[PDB]
């Protein structure tokens, strides 16, 4: 899965 | 019962590494940020970098980037931060804190603080 | 990086008065999910930092009615009415949109009887 980060990225 | 456990203080030698512990209990470690906060004494906070739990994607402070190594480890609901070639300028107060629950945007804040390491640098 | 600058380094206030606390960022802080991630932090000594007010003007739970935040752009601000011996301590504000993420220099709320 794929989770939002808080920098931006797709973690 | 949420909680950051952190040891009360380390003291670590010049040129040598330490390795602090910030373990959580109480909340599902996997679902949210940890970070971690330097506060010289008698100085602000001075924010060093976060880790997914869930994936151990780090984001880093570029100015700490050859000087903080970021860890986690699930079975133990434990994060690490290893501080190396300790300087005197390393003593400090460092706090771990929970920085937001992953899927709800509006509650990335550091609700849930540790009670901060005193690291001491010295021989 | 953004600089948050806040002012007053430290501010005396009598009981009862309304104290207030400006943090200005060198740039905007609209994270790129839509949110301003502007928080106020108070640390009171001895103590670990803990949250007061979050998304510029957002109450946490348990936070009383006089701590109020507002403000846009690049200019917040913390507004404390009647002051009461129990708010003493060092108030942070903090940016949470753009990494690295960063705190003001902190004011020093003091209390004068």
């Known amino acids: 899965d794929c989770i939002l980060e808080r920098d931006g990225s797709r973690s | 019962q949420v909680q950051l456990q952190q040891s009360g203080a380390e003291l670590a030698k010049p040129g040598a590494s330490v390795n602090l512990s910030c373990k959580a209990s109480?909340?599902?470690?996997?679902?949210?940020?940890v970070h971690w906060v330097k506060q010289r004494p008698g100085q602000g906070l001075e924010w060093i970098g976060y880790?997914?739990?869930?994936?151990?994607?780090?984001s880093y402070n570029q100015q700490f980037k050859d000087k903080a190594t970021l860890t986690a480890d699930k079975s133990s609901s434990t994060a690490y931060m290893q501080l190396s070639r300790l300087t005197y300028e390393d003593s400090s107060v460092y706090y771990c804190?929970?920085?937001?629950?992953?899927?709800?945007?509006?509650?990335?804040?550091?609700?849930?603080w540790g009670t901060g390491t005193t690291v001491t640098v010295s021989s | 990086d953004v600089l948050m600058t806040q002012i007053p380094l430290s501010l005396p206030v009598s009981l009862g008065d309304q104290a207030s606390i400006s943090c200005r960022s060198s740039?905007?802080?609209?994270?790129?999910?839509?949110?301003?991630?502007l928080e106020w932090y108070l640390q009171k000594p001895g103590q670990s930092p803990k949250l007061l007010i979050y998304?510029?003007?957002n109450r946490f739970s348990g936070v009383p009615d006089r701590f109020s935040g507002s403000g846009s752009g690049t200019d917040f601000t913390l507004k404390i009415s009647r002051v009461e011996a129990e708010d003493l301590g060092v108030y942070y504000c903090?940016?949470?949109?753009?990494?690295?993420?960063?705190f003001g220099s902190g004011t020093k709320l003091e209390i004068k009887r």
């Open positions: 740039q905007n802080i609209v994270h790129s999910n839509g949110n301003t991630y």
């Open positions: 804190a929970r920085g937001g629950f992953f899927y709800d945007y509006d509650v990335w804040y550091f609700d849930v």
């Open positions: 109480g909340y599902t470690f996997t679902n949210y940020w």
């Open positions: 998304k510029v003007s």
């Open positions: 903090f940016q949470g949109s753009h990494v690295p993420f960063t």
């Open positions: 880790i997914n739990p869930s994936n151990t994607y780090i």
